Amino acid sequence: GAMAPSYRVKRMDIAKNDEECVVNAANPRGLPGDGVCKAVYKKWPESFKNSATPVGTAKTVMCGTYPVIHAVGPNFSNYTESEGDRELAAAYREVAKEVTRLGVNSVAIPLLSTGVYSGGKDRLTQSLNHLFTAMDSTDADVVIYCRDKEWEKKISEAIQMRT
Numbered sequence: 036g037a038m039a040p041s042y043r044v045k046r047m048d049i050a051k052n053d054e055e056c057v058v059n060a061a062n063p064r065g066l067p068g069d070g071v072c073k074a075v076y077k078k079w080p081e082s083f084k085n086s087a088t089p090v091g092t093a094k095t096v097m098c099g100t101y102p103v104i105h106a107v108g109p110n111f112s113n114y115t116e117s118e119g120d121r122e123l124a125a126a127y128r129e130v131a132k133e134v135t136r137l138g139v140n141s142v143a144i145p146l147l148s149t150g151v152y153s154g155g156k157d158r159l160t161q162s163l164n165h166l167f168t169a170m171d172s173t174d175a176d177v178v179i180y181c182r183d184k185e186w187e188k189k190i191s192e193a194i195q196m197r198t
């Protein structure tokens with residue numbers, strides 16, 4: 036575990052993280068995909084061997100000894116708000132199980148279902164609160180990666196609010 040488990044946020048490419056493992060915002064079919072998933076494919080292509088997994092689940096594949104946790108958020112284009120909310124919560128619970136099993140002291144994590152799976156809605160608060168529900172009981176240092184300067188500020192404020 037970490038000596039004083041923390042949450043942090045950085046505005047940079049998750050493919051350049053400084054943590055002991057990465058969560059991919061994966062598609063269910065293990066395809067290179069777009070956005071975070073494409074950056075992950077370019078950096079850790081070996082981790083997409085037999086990475087296909089259903090919505091609401093996480094499947095870990097090693098790239099050398101570096102774990103890539105493929106976490107499949109719902110595409111809110113296809114799911115109802117209610118069923119999508121349930122699957123998004125579930126995907127983060129499966130990430131917490133994997134991070135615990137791996138015995139890492141730190142993890143790099145994107146906000147699931149906030150980009151091309153967002154169904155055109157701002158889901159910062161929804162996705163972040165599901166991340167917290169899952170990860171609060173873990174002792175890994177969690178570092179959240181985002182792209183947008185206004186998102187960085189809002190994520191930082193939500194972390195600082197609980198401290």
Ligand SMILES: Oc1ccc2c(c1)OCO2
Binds near residue numbers: 048
């Ligand atoms: O400020 C940035 C945040 C995320 C990125 C990026 C720049 O390049 C690729 O992903």
Ligand SMILES: Oc1ccc2c(c1)OCO2
Binds near residue numbers: 047050070071074180
């Ligand atoms: O398009 C992106 C690729 C990598 C990223 C990201 C966006 O935000 C964090 O890391």
Ligand SMILES: [Cl-]
Binds near residue numbers: 046047048051
């Ligand atoms: Cl970057």
Ligand SMILES: [Cl-]
Binds near residue numbers: 147
């Ligand atoms: Cl997404």
Ligand SMILES: [Cl-]
Binds near residue numbers: 182183
């Ligand atoms: Cl973002």
